[PDB]
Amino acid sequence: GAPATVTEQGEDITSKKDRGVLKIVKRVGNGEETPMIGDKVYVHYKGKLSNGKKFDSSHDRNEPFVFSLGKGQVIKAWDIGVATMKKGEIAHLLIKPEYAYGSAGSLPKIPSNATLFFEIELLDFKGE
Numbered sequence: 001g002a003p004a005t006v007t008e009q010g011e012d013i014t015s016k017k018d019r020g021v022l023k024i025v026k027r028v029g030n031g032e033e034t035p036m037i038g039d040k041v042y043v044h045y046k047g048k049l050s051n052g053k054k055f056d057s058s059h060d061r062n063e064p065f066v067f068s069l070g071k072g073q074v075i076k077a078w079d080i081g082v083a084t085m086k087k088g089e090i091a092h093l094l095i096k097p098e099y100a101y102g103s104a105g106s107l108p109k110i111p112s113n114a115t116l117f118f119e120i121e122l123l124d125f126k127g128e
């Protein structure tokens with residue numbers, strides 16, 4: 001379903017161009033601008049293992065997820081991916097382990113060599 005579409009049609013947003021991170025824009029945002037590295041970004045997300053066996057949403061906690069973009073505080077795929085988004089945009093990310101938690105994984109939530117999928121909504125951003 002969503003994951004497969006992304007494999008087929010997603011844009012490669014890696015620097016190395018290794019298809020480790022593919023993206024589809026599902027809902028177009030507003031503004032002419034994305035956040036700059038170091039901006040504080042506010043997102044909602046729904047995340048799962050590509051095989052659907054563990055799931056997670058910021059909506060489960062009724063709290064936006066906040067981080068400083070491109071500052072290495074989260075998995076690489078997020079730093080790279082959210083930086084491509086506009087305010088109000090929803091995007092689908094499909095993420096090979098090298099841009100997530102690699103072979104070590106992070107048990108018990110994430111196993112070795114797991115592909116991740118996220119729907120992310122970029123609610124807002126500010127250059128703090």
Ligand SMILES: COc1cc([C@@H](C(=O)N2CCCC[C@H]2C(=O)OCc2cnc(C)s2)C2CCCCC2)cc(OC)c1OC
Nearest residue numbers: 045047048049054055056065074075078106109110116117
């Ligand atoms: C390995 O740690 C965790 C990872 C995540 C999710 C995850 O991988 N996240 C959370 C959303 C931000 C991207 C990515 C991550 O960088 O996690 C490190 C965390 C930063 N802040 C957190 C509360 S977890 C994971 C995505 C696929 C379905 C399984 C959950 C949520 C977690 O708890 C909500 C978590 O435990 C702290």
